């Protein structure tokens, strides 16, 4: 297997002379073949904040990572890296990463406070924002890196284990692991025999693992976006025994819904970032699945639990969703987001300053969607299913609403059982 230089949302040259090195919510970085050299352009989506600039690349940088304070460039073969702060306060700096025979840099990443470099032999090299080196670590061969503040999410690959991931924090002194080389259940690309003349074959030669992008969510949860075009989020990563990968967006299904239940072939999603409940992306219209020049304006795609079936969506009919079927997904989504956010606040506290209200609204949406399911269950005289739904309610005021719904539905045994829940919670509340 050949380790290829990876960068988040990077695109291949393909049959053209330009491509994107990397791409996220901050902006995009492109490189153009300029005879014997290259012309690198760093652009931003917040044109107010930052100023687009460019420079001549005499080195042939094929690795890049963009954050809000600077840009990191990498050269996979010579091992030359350069960090370029956006602002004039700090100076650019360059370094040469030691590389053994056949060892290539496979991925680079940078935050305002950390710079990380990964190699094909699994060497993990980290620095601070000024280039002061940390201890050097040896891990499994690295294929992809991303980072946020002091935390690093790394993907590894062998012929032995397959794909794994690590989740760590780069402290003042040493590196500490939240998760160390756990299984990474991302689906690999299934390349056929009719792909050798396919228009998109170039991408999988450029990115064999098919990792279109990977990143921390705005709230700090690791995400990855593979060739199956499903957004996977890592849940409960602070609890090793409870950690789970959750599929929280089938973008193929969303495009199908956007197209009014019609199968398309010319619309594709390019992932930039995850903001709370919304996928920042590029909608690529064309033959190829990666964006080209000029770059479209970023779009937004709300995450959706993959519980919708095409056949059932057609019968109830842009596609409209039956309020009852919509309630199941909204319940599931709210349940997941609430559980994630609660873990974030109880461990890291607030970051932006409005999370508690977000969580509060979240729990509100949760109970509301749950009550709609409860209503439906009551209408079908399904007391058992209704009681199970009632148990999942959060607010005591929501238990009240369920009783009132049960009363109107004339289900007296259900009412008593729900009031038992109220009493049972009051008893546990005093212990």
């Amino acid at each position: 297997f050949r380790y290829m230089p990876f960068s988040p949302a990077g695109t291949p040259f393909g049959f053209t002379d330009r491509r994107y090195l990397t791409m996220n919510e901050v902006g995009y970085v492109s490189t153009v073949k300029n005879s014997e050299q290259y012309s690198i352009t760093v652009s931003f989506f917040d044109v107010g904040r930052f100023r687009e600039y460019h420079f001549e690349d005499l080195f042939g940088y094929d690795l890049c990572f963009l954050n809000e304070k600077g840009t990191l460039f990498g050269q996979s073969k010579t091992g030359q890296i350069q960090y370029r702060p956006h602002d004039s306060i700090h100076s650019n700096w360059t370094k040469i990463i030691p590389l053994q025979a056949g060892e290539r840099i496979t991925s680079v990443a940078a935050t305002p406070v950390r710079v990380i470099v990964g190699t094909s032999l699994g060497y993990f090299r980290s620095f601070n924002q000024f280039g002061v080196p940390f201890a050097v670590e040896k891990t499994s061969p690295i294929v992809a890196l991303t980072a946020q503040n002091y935390r690093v999410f790394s993907v590894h690959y062998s012929q032995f284990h397959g794909l794994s991931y690590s989740l760590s924090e780069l402290g003042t002194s040493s590196k500490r692991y939240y998760k160390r080389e756990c299984p990474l259940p991302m689906s690999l690309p299934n390349i056929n025999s009719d792909m050798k003349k396919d228009a998109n074959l170039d991408y999988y030669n450029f990115n064999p693992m098919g990792i279109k992008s990977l990143f921390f969510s705005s709230y700090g949860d690791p995400c990855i976006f593979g060739s199956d075009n499903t957004l996977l989020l890592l849940s409960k990563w602070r609890s090793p025994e409870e950690s789970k990968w959750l599929p929280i967006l089938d973008s193929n299904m969303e495009i199908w819904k956007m197209s009014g239940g019609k199968e398309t072939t010319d619309i594709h999603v390019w992932p930039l970032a995850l903001a709370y409940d919304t996928l920042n992306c590029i909608l690529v219209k064309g033959k190829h699945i990666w964006p080209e020049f000029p770059l479209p304006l970023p779009s937004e795609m709300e995450i959706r639990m993959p519980v919708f079936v095409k056949s059932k969506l057609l019968e109830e009919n842009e596609i409209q969703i039956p309020v009852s079927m919509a309630a199941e997904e909204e319940y599931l989504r709210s349940k997941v987001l609430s559980e994630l956010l609660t873990d974030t606040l109880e461990n890291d506290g607030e970051m932006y300053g409005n999370e508690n209200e977000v969580l509060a609204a979240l729990n509100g949406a949760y109970d509301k969607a749950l009550l709609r399911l409860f209503a439906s269950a009551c209408s079908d005289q399904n007391v058992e299913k209704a009681l199970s739904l009632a148990h999942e309610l959060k607010q005591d005021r929501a238990l009240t609403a369920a009783v009132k719904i049960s009363e109107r539905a004339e289900l007296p045994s259900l009412v008593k059982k729900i009031n038992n829940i109220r009493e049972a919670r009051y008893e546990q509340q005093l212990k």
Partner: peptide, 10 residues
């Protein structure tokens, strides 16, 4: 049940 549902939202 629409009236009870509306009461909880506010």
């Amino acid at each position: 049940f629409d009236d009870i549902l509306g009461e909880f939202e506010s």
